[PDB]
């Protein structure tokens, strides 16, 4: 029996984007995803009370532009056989730095490390660990780029292999890519 984990963040509504794309929103039927792991930058509780609608288990991490400060700056969870680490990623300098992200992986002692902020999607394995960045679901802009392709990641967890699906909205048609990771 599969576990499906939704991974998304850097929404940045209302300031940077009005709402998540309807096309994305149509795919996230409530109940069909069991877990939700969010990198942060919602930022308003509008979205936090929205994410709750879609699944019973939802975890936020604190973003540098998140207004509810009680979110944890990082969270470690387990789903099936996978120990997952979650962090927004503004703590990593330079942004998305590999060596730094690796420490947080070993420090957190996780199989999969999720981080955001760079608004750039990543899903890859490094030294037998798997690193995910869902990118920005709204396509929100970062300090350096204005045409950022919206995207969110859905993890399919089956025993010791996670299948990671990324859906990025290029043009106005959802498109996806598969990346498979097995615990070593």
């Amino acid at each position: 029996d599969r576990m499906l984990v939704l991974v998304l963040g850097d929404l940045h509504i209302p300031h940077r984007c009005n709402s998540l794309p309807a096309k994305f929103k149509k795919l996230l039927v409530p109940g069909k995803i069991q877990h939700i792991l969010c990198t942060g930058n919602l930022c308003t509780k509008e979205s936090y009370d929205y994410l709750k609608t879609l699944a019973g288990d939802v975890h936020i991490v604190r973003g540098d532009f998140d207004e509810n400060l009680n979110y944890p700056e990082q969270k470690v969870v387990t789903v099936g056989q996978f120990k997952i680490g979650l962090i927004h990623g503004h703590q990593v300098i330079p942004w998305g730095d590999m060596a730094s992200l690796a420490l947080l992986q070993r420090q957190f002692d996780v199989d999969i490390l999720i981080s955001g902020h760079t608004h750039k999607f990543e899903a890859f394995e490094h030294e037998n660990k798997f690193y995910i960045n869902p990118g920005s679901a709204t396509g929100a802009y970062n300090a350096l780029e204005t045409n950022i392709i919206p995207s969110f990641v859905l993890m399919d967890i089956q025993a010791s292999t996670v299948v990671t699906y990324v859906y990025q909205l290029i043009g106005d048609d959802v498109k996806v890519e598969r990346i498979e990771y097995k615990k070593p």
């Binding site: 700056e73 503004h90 703590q91 990593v92 300098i93 730095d97 060596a99 420490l103």
Partner: peptide, 14 residues
């Protein structure tokens, strides 16, 4: 580097 609530420290030398 790693930005923490208690400082910002290099991960290694450099």
């Amino acid at each position: 580097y790693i930005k923490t609530p208690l400082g910002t420290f290099p991960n290694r030398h450099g």
